[PDB]
Design an enzyme around this catalytic site. Structure first.
Site, mmCIF file in Angstrom:
data_model
loop_
_atom_site.group_PDB
_atom_site.id
_atom_site.type_symbol
_atom_site.label_atom_id
_atom_site.label_comp_id
_atom_site.label_asym_id
_atom_site.label_seq_id
_atom_site.Cartn_x
_atom_site.Cartn_y
_atom_site.Cartn_z
ATOM 1 N N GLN A 39 9.430 -7.664 -31.074
ATOM 2 C CA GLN A 39 8.214 -6.900 -30.794
ATOM 3 C C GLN A 39 8.265 -6.387 -29.351
ATOM 4 O O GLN A 39 7.844 -5.265 -29.065
ATOM 5 C CB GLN A 39 6.969 -7.764 -31.046
ATOM 6 C CG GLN A 39 6.655 -8.001 -32.526
ATOM 7 C CD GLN A 39 6.390 -6.714 -33.319
ATOM 8 O OE1 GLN A 39 5.680 -5.803 -32.875
ATOM 9 N NE2 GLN A 39 6.942 -6.652 -34.509
ATOM 10 N N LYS A 169 15.158 5.373 -34.711
ATOM 11 C CA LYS A 169 15.994 4.190 -34.649
ATOM 12 C C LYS A 169 17.432 4.739 -34.787
ATOM 13 O O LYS A 169 17.702 5.594 -35.643
ATOM 14 C CB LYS A 169 15.637 3.341 -35.848
ATOM 15 C CG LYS A 169 16.275 2.017 -35.946
ATOM 16 C CD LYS A 169 15.949 1.514 -37.331
ATOM 17 C CE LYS A 169 16.295 0.070 -37.522
ATOM 18 N NZ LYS A 169 15.268 -0.767 -36.879
ATOM 19 N N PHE A 174 29.827 1.210 -38.062
ATOM 20 C CA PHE A 174 31.101 0.759 -37.527
ATOM 21 C C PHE A 174 32.256 1.664 -37.919
ATOM 22 O O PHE A 174 32.375 2.053 -39.074
ATOM 23 C CB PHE A 174 31.337 -0.696 -37.922
ATOM 24 C CG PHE A 174 30.203 -1.578 -37.538
ATOM 25 C CD1 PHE A 174 29.555 -1.382 -36.316
ATOM 26 C CD2 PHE A 174 29.696 -2.516 -38.421
ATOM 27 C CE1 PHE A 174 28.410 -2.099 -35.979
ATOM 28 C CE2 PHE A 174 28.550 -3.243 -38.101
ATOM 29 C CZ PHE A 174 27.903 -3.033 -36.876
ATOM 30 N N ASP A 176 35.220 1.036 -38.510
ATOM 31 C CA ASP A 176 36.010 0.442 -39.584
ATOM 32 C C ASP A 176 35.296 0.387 -40.946
ATOM 33 O O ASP A 176 35.846 -0.092 -41.934
ATOM 34 C CB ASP A 176 36.572 -0.935 -39.170
ATOM 35 C CG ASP A 176 35.494 -1.994 -38.962
ATOM 36 O OD1 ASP A 176 34.363 -1.653 -38.541
ATOM 37 O OD2 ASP A 176 35.800 -3.185 -39.206
ATOM 38 N N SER A 199 23.588 -6.299 -30.146
ATOM 39 C CA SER A 199 23.108 -5.123 -30.864
ATOM 40 C C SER A 199 23.651 -3.831 -30.214
ATOM 41 O O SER A 199 23.781 -3.724 -28.981
ATOM 42 C CB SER A 199 21.574 -5.109 -30.864
ATOM 43 O OG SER A 199 21.030 -4.090 -31.673
ATOM 44 N N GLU A 227 30.793 1.668 -30.189
ATOM 45 C CA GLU A 227 31.154 0.264 -30.359
ATOM 46 C C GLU A 227 31.663 -0.395 -29.081
ATOM 47 O O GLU A 227 31.216 -1.487 -28.707
ATOM 48 C CB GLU A 227 32.216 0.171 -31.440
ATOM 49 C CG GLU A 227 32.852 -1.173 -31.572
ATOM 50 C CD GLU A 227 33.888 -1.217 -32.685
ATOM 51 O OE1 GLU A 227 35.070 -0.892 -32.412
ATOM 52 O OE2 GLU A 227 33.512 -1.570 -33.826
HETATM 53 N N1 LIG Z 1 10.513 4.698 -46.979
HETATM 54 C C1 LIG Z 1 9.939 3.912 -46.074
HETATM 55 N N2 LIG Z 1 8.705 4.240 -45.644
HETATM 56 C C2 LIG Z 1 8.020 3.419 -44.898
HETATM 57 N N3 LIG Z 1 8.459 2.285 -44.397
HETATM 58 C C3 LIG Z 1 9.753 1.996 -44.768
HETATM 59 C C4 LIG Z 1 10.525 2.723 -45.600
HETATM 60 N N4 LIG Z 1 11.704 2.019 -45.877
HETATM 61 C C5 LIG Z 1 11.724 0.974 -45.130
HETATM 62 N N5 LIG Z 1 10.568 0.914 -44.378
HETATM 63 C C6 LIG Z 1 10.086 -0.207 -43.532
HETATM 64 O O1 LIG Z 1 10.943 -0.283 -42.407
HETATM 65 C C7 LIG Z 1 10.557 -1.540 -41.840
HETATM 66 C C8 LIG Z 1 11.583 -2.019 -40.846
HETATM 67 S S1 LIG Z 1 10.992 -3.343 -39.777
HETATM 68 C C9 LIG Z 1 9.865 -2.386 -38.773
HETATM 69 C C10 LIG Z 1 9.075 -3.206 -37.773
HETATM 70 C C11 LIG Z 1 7.915 -2.430 -37.147
HETATM 71 N N6 LIG Z 1 8.392 -1.194 -36.544
HETATM 72 C C12 LIG Z 1 7.242 -3.281 -36.080
HETATM 73 O O2 LIG Z 1 6.759 -2.673 -35.107
HETATM 74 O O3 LIG Z 1 6.936 -4.460 -36.383
HETATM 75 C C13 LIG Z 1 10.066 -2.540 -42.934
HETATM 76 O O4 LIG Z 1 8.713 -2.991 -42.678
HETATM 77 C C14 LIG Z 1 10.145 -1.625 -44.155
HETATM 78 O O5 LIG Z 1 9.173 -1.900 -45.209
#
Ligand SMILES: Nc1ncnc2c1ncn2[C@@H]1O[C@H](CSCC[C@H](N)C(=O)O)[C@@H](O)[C@H]1O
Ligand SMILES: Nc1ncnc2c1ncn2[C@@H]1O[C@H](CSCC[C@H](N)C(=O)O)[C@@H](O)[C@H]1O
Lengths: 291, 291
Positions: A39, A169, A174, A176, A199, A227
């Site tokens: 978070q 995001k 990767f 490979d 990450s 990478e």
């Molecule tokens: N088509 C879609 N539309 C909406 N949400 C989606 C999605 N496919 C996946 N996700 C969502 O992507 C999320 C990734 S986790 C996201 C965490 C959030 N940003 C935070 O602030 O807590 C999951 O909750 C999942 O349900």
């Protein structure tokens, strides 16, 4: 102890000036050292992105469409920060999962329990019309195929929604496990303090001008570069104690967080940038329940 | 008689400085006044496009992938012109229909009888590798849905093929038959002499730099603008006799053709631009069997 004196931290991917052959055994090393580190990671990047748009005069009056927003605990902080600053924003949080109840009861924030598809994007575009949209995407499917499908959805988000800006995001697959080259929107590759230990994820930040949409191709050779640059950053850099950084915590991620937080606007006036940051950080950790 | 003195003709869509409310009864008016006018239209635009790439040093050594090339009678002329100039080019003509037999027996030209899909594009990309590609697309499905699907394929052509340049068939759908906004590659909107009387079709010409791909959104409001600018050009402009144009044929389309043809390179040396053009044009009409 791993000490060093640093001028500034690496803020963008393009700044990383070194690489290291990725060691697969790194995947077994401790990924997080703080409670609710995820978070925190998200809050800092989004505070950084949104503060920039404010600086450019494009935040006030916009509707922020955050897709993949659940639980979204940290979003409560974000919303409060801008709301208290007097900025007028409508939040539309869409995820098939449910949001943290702290988001309920706010007239300015709409929670939608829906997994978005291209068709749904069209209907909400018709419904948001004619408000200016700021998109934030954090959807998660894993495999290179999962990633590609995610990236493909993110581009459809921009094309149908046609936002004035976006935070996506972004983790390159990767080399490979390469399937095929693809395109991502052009934008700044913001590095993330408090990301998991190894990450390679960053956030793609873009501001849209005119009616043009510029994309950029990503190839396997690019994948190898991501990478190694990210591995160097994770293994070497993030493990440093910045001794010339006079701050309660001198570990690299705090030095890095300091530079993002110093760009944030507060009502309260501070005599120094260090005071504002200590304040924002204390405030953030208290909100997230991080000791 | 409809006379006028003109400096130059409209070469690009952006140059059209006037509009006219489209009159649907125009669709019943004679569309062509010359035999094989379609091959002529195509030959001029492609000679124009390819001569430009030569001028930029990007033609020699490339493989031209022409999709939607059949019958392709006029392509024989194009191939001969550059071949005789000493430019080294490989032609790959792909269409599910068969090509004019005049294209057979040339080691530099490969005829493929296949309707291309995204998957096929991937295999030919693997096979052309590592040659530089110049894409030319003239595929035809009609409906706004047919068009959109065509445009969508053309963008996949560029993304998989990753060409150094492209010429794409481009006619904006009718605003009154609008389905949804979309993106087309950024490029010059080349106007076409000898297009049908009331055609709103142009050719999108692009040269790709770096690894970026810039697109542009097209909306219904853009559709209305295309319709009126093209209607003004067709109804008013193309019906002019350019009296200050000292040439055997003074009709607007010949004035327009003259400006595209003057950019073409010939081995033979001419004392004036007018002599080169008369020569190229005579040569072109003789080849296409146009009196
Ligand atoms: N088509 C879609 N539309 C909406 N949400 C989606 C999605 N496919 C996946 N996700 C969502 O992507 C999320 C990734 S986790 C996201 C965490 C959030 N940003 C935070 O602030 O807590 C999951 O909750 C999942 O349900
Ligand atoms: N998927 C596809 N791949 C290849 N050709 C296609 C196609 N879909 C349609 N086309 C072709 O698009 C063409 C439009 S007519 C093209 C005329 C040609 N450029 C000339 O110089 O004569 C038709 O021949 C049709 O078969």
């Amino acid at each position: 102890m791993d000490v060093v004196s640093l001028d500034k931290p690496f803020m963008y991917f393009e700044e990383i000036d070194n690489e290291l052959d990725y060691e697969p055994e790194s995947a077994n090393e401790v990924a997080k050292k703080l409670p609710y580190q995820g978070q925190l990671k998200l809050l800092l990047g989004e505070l950084f992105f949104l503060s920039k748009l404010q600086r450019h005069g494009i935040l006030d009056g916009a509707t922020v469409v955050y897709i993949g927003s659940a639980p979204g605990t940290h979003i409560r902080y974000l919303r409060d920060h801008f709301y208290n600053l007097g900025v007028i924003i409508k939040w539309m949080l869409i995820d098939g999962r449910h949001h943290d109840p702290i988001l309920n009861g706010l007239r300015d924030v709409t929670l939608v329990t829906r997994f978005v598809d291209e068709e749904y994007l069209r209907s909400i575009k018709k419904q948001l019309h004619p408000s200016k949209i700021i998109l934030i995407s954090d959807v998660r499917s894993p495999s290179t195929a999962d990633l590609l499908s995610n990236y493909a959805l993110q581009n459809v988000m921009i094309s149908i929604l046609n936002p004035v800006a976006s935070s996506l995001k972004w983790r390159c697959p990767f080399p490979d496990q390469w399937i095929k080259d693809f395109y991502i929107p052009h934008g700044n590759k913001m590095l993330q303090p408090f990301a998991p230990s190894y990450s390679a994820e960053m956030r793609l930040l873009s501001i849209y001008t005119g009616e043009n949409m510029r994309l950029t191709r990503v190839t396997k050779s690019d994948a190898v570069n991501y990478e190694k640059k990210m591995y160097y950053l994770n293994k070497i850099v993030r493990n440093k104690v910045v001794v010339n950084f006079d701050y309660p915590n001198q570990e690299y991620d705090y030095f890095h967080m300091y530079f993002m937080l110093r760009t944030v606007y507060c009502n309260k006036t501070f005599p120094t940038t260090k005071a504002k940051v200590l304040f924002l950080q204390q405030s953030i950790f208290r909100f997230l329940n991080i000791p």
